Amino acid sequence: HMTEYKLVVVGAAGVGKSALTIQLIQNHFVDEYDDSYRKQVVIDGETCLLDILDTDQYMRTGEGFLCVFAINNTKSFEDIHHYREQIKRVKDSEDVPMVLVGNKSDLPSRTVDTKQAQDLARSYGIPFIETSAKTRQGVDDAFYTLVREIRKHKEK
Numbered sequence: 001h002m003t004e005y006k007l008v009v010v011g012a013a014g015v016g017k018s019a020l021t022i023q024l025i026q027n028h029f030v031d032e033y034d035d036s037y038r039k040q041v042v043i044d045g046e047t048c049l050l051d052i053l054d055t056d057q058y059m060r061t062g063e064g065f066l067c068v069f070a071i072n073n074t075k076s077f078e079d080i081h082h083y084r085e086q087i088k089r090v091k092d093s094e095d096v097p098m099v100l101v102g103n104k105s106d107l108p109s110r111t112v113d114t115k116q117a118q119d120l121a122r123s124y125g126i127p128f129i130e131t132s133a134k135t136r137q138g139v140d141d142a143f144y145t146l147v148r149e150i151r152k153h154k155e156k
């Protein structure tokens with residue numbers, strides 16, 4: 001009675017992968033942290049069980065990927081290329097469900113502009129969503145959009 005979606009969250013250290021996952025799950029912002037999580041949620045009339053790995057037999061079996069950088073961490077943005085190449089390598093495909101997420105939108109120290117990010121996402125043929133795990137802006141959007149990209153890609 002529920003559709004399972006296996007989602008994987010990837011990106012450089014400190015970008016807020018856990019904090020995003022934890023917002024989605026417990027609607028709380030964790031300043032201080034350090035596996036798999038489940039969330040049941042209705043998306044467009046379908047009861048979904050999200051199976052989320054916050055980072056292989058999850059890399060190879062993942063159905064969709066959130067590729068996260070922080071908008072105040074130019075390196076993390078530059079690293080996205082590597083993570084996308086990694087995902088492509090495991091799946092012999094240039095069409096893997098994926099969303100580029102620019103996190104920490106609440107912070108003032110912004111070194112990656114919305115147009116760099118938009119340009120990168122356009123080149124890959126994927127959505128870009130800006131988030132803050134702190135304020136919760138964009139978080140549901142990012143996960144719901146990923147679910148929708150998986151459905152666009154294959155029957156579920």
Ligand SMILES: Nc1nc2c(ncn2[C@@H]2O[C@@H](COP(=O)(O)OP(=O)(O)NP(=O)(O)O)[C@@H](O)[C@@H]2O)c(=O)[nH]1
Nearest residue numbers: 013014015016017018019030031033104132133134
């Ligand atoms: N203002 C603000 N701060 C944020 C936001 N999101 C996270 N933070 C902050 O950075 C955290 C570090 O993020 P984590 O979730 O642990 O990062 P991971 O990518 O999981 N690292 P790893 O497990 O690969 O080592 C933490 O100091 C603080 O909560 C956000 O949106 N805004």
Ligand SMILES: [Mg+2]
Nearest residue numbers: 017018054055
């Ligand atoms: Mg983490």
